[PDB]
Design a protein around this ligand. Structure first.
Ligand SMILES: O=c1[nH]cnc2c([C@@H]3N[C@H](CO)[C@@H](O)[C@H]3O)c[nH]c12
Ligand SMILES: O=c1[nH]cnc2c([C@@H]3N[C@H](CO)[C@@H](O)[C@H]3O)c[nH]c12
Ligand SMILES: O=c1[nH]cnc2c([C@@H]3N[C@H](CO)[C@@H](O)[C@H]3O)c[nH]c12
Lengths: 282, 282, 282
């Protein structure tokens, strides 16, 4: 891990002394969900490039910014653009922000992402709640906590069986009903793979047998580092596409179909998030 | 990825200006199948050592050569000796040739390899056709496409559900009948593991439950980079041994038994490949 | 692999000329089982820090020592404190001792460790014998043998289906009866994951479906390098905790509960090991 404890501090202090805002909730906007930034009030923006020790984005969208502000009466801080393993970043870079948020005072993390549908009942547009995850990269060694443990942040062997806040999962289901949506809120397991290429048919079959409901290439590292931190954790997935599960098909997965899905569910996603802010205890 | 786009170009140009040949089909000869080199006509040889930017072979067989020529009226280019992950090479080295082939003008890749038999119906000598693969290393992070994407070669998130050419799979089955072989042509899923040690009994059981038919320690990376390239892809496996699946057994897997299998199926493999060349569209 | 063959030699020679002892059996004491060191007679201690080329322990317990001596009339050598992947060590460091033991003359390796219980019949305190393992990190690339093979130690593609000595497994069962323990000796498959965080519920379910009986974050690399060496291999697991397998639970895994388990089964573990020494042929 190239980051000493001081690096985390220095980044925190720099931000603390560059904004009067003091966030409680950190939000990581997944693919095509960055619109949430609009709903914040008194929004103060900071590009990653200007933030000391921040993994400088390669050439994805060049619009990696930390947007502070208030969302439904809640001191937030949003990441509009995130880092992934498939871009070449070591997991201690992918998750460097989460520890910065902690030192800033945040005590709750909301992670959102786009993912394929493994559960056959799911459908494009659906919003699966994350009850649990399967960290395939972690089994093999790729775990953000790898290396000497910094007791200052947390313990050597933190548990993950209680990763996703039960309360939040329950309160989010409520809010959804108090929205009268046709499609019932979904809930399940999120499996992470590194990507960047898409699953073959055989691969999807594996992921289903494993018991995964949806598949993405992010989130899990951030969640793990968060939990090791003491942060409360809630998150969901926007089922942007159903994974191909038969060879007699004539369909393929593509960034187009995925971004298009994000595009439509755009505002519906924002509403849901904004409202839920009221459920986060103080 | 240590290779810039220029490196690929320079290697391509060097080859282009060092041979009058202009290949359409690239062939990667798996373990003990390198004999195919004999069947080429007007065969021009190039050792990897002399080819700029080519991963220089460690000390496997020191006979890593790129052999250009014609095979059954088809401008080929064969790799007699390939690179593996277990030898320590990063996947962007293991698959550097595939992108060189592309810039040379190749538009079809034939991958062959030796592998164990997971499907219980399989037998030593069998020739399993590859319908699909399970990229275990990829799930964890080891994917040749890892790092910044070079739009010049392909997209950021390429699909793999349609990796192995349907047409070719069908036409290869034909050719086999027009050979009157006792054993029917086999077809199935190829699972990749990094090796270099062999699967335990428990491990084989896992691979079978995953739904894999055969297991090897190569190919998948090359296929992925190929598909990201637009190349058509066909490939097969020479079931050189049945994996041990019971503890009451008294059998072990070894390079001897594997090379011996390659040795007998040697010519039979060549015939099949050479003929199929006629099925590859122009 | 940062270690040349000379490095192994130099370390061996240094030890050979620093102790009159010449071990036959090497013992790797897992978590909370390091007490075995007491039972040795004519015990000569060597801290890792003083041993050339030895992976210098970071800041776990600072008590990494190689303790030579006799155990039940058997020239031993024990590792009180081991290296793990989650601490950041490359597997060729984690397993550097095993090859040092070989050059010292050892021909048998006993590996012990603490692990969670996947098999539902298991219970805290139980002692599962290792019949086989599932090397998840290995599938993805993390295999101690990765890189150029040193024929001097062993072959390029060693088998692992016969990793755990049948004889020993049988003789250990005997010894246990000749102990009249209430709980029958357990036996099964050990699955390795890198850690350092604990499995989620979904993760445990995966490991069970894979067919694993217990889960830990070590051992497998050492075993593999041992077998590639020609060493006989025996080992067991102290089921220190049952992994959480339902979401309706209110239990978590922690280093406290694990070390506490090691603490009670402490001596019972030693007795078993010490006695078994007599079963190891000469
Ligand atoms: O089916 C899928 N498999 C793997 N990742 C994704 C994604 C997520 N969307 C992004 C690619 O569009 C990528 O960042 C990935 O994490 C959507 N659908 C799938
Ligand atoms: O049962 C098997 N498991 C894993 N690899 C292989 C192979 C292939 N053959 C080579 C070892 O002989 C190695 O390069 C591997 O990719 C044959 N049989 C098996
Ligand atoms: O349930 C478990 N999962 C993964 N590792 C362990 C362990 C072993 N104990 C250590 C953590 O207490 C760690 O070194 C690990 O290898 C005990 N129980 C479990």
């Amino acid at each position: 891990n190239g980051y000493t404890y001081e690096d985390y501090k220095n980044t925190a202090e720099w931000l603390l002394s560059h904004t009067k805002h003091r966030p409680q909730v950190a939000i990581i906007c997944g693919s095509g969900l960055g619109g949430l930034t609009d709903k914040l009030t008194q929004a103060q923006i900071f590009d990653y490039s200007e933030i000391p020790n921040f993994p400088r984005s390669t050439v994805p969208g060049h619009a990696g910014r930390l947007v502070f502000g208030f969302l439904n009466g809640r001191a937030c801080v949003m990441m509009q653009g995130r880092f992934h393993m498939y871009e070449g970043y070591p997991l201690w870079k992918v998750t460097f922000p989460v520890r910065v948020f902690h030192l800033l005072g945040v005590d709750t993390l909301v992670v959102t992402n786009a993912a394929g549908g493994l559960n056959p009942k799911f459908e494009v547009g659906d919003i699966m709640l994350i009850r649990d995850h399967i960290n395939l990269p972690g089994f093999s060694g790729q775990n953000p906590l790898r290396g000497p443990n910094d007791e200052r942040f947390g313990d050597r062997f933190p548990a993950m069986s209680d990763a996703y806040d039960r309360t939040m999962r329950q309160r989010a289901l409520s809010t959804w009903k108090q929205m009268g949506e046709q499609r019932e809120l979904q809930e399940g397991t999120y499996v992470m793979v590194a990507g960047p290429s898409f699953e073959t048919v055989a691969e999807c079959r594996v992921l289903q047998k494993l018991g995964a409901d949806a598949v993405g290439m992010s989130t899990v590292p951030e969640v793990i580092v968060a939990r090791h931190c003491g942060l409360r954790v809630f998150g969901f997935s926007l089922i942007t596409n159903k994974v191909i599960m038969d060879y007699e098909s004539l369909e393929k997965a593509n960034h187009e179909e995925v971004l298009a899905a994000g595009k439509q569910a755009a505002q519906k996603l924002e509403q849901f998030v904004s409202i839920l802010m009221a459920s986060i205890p103080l």
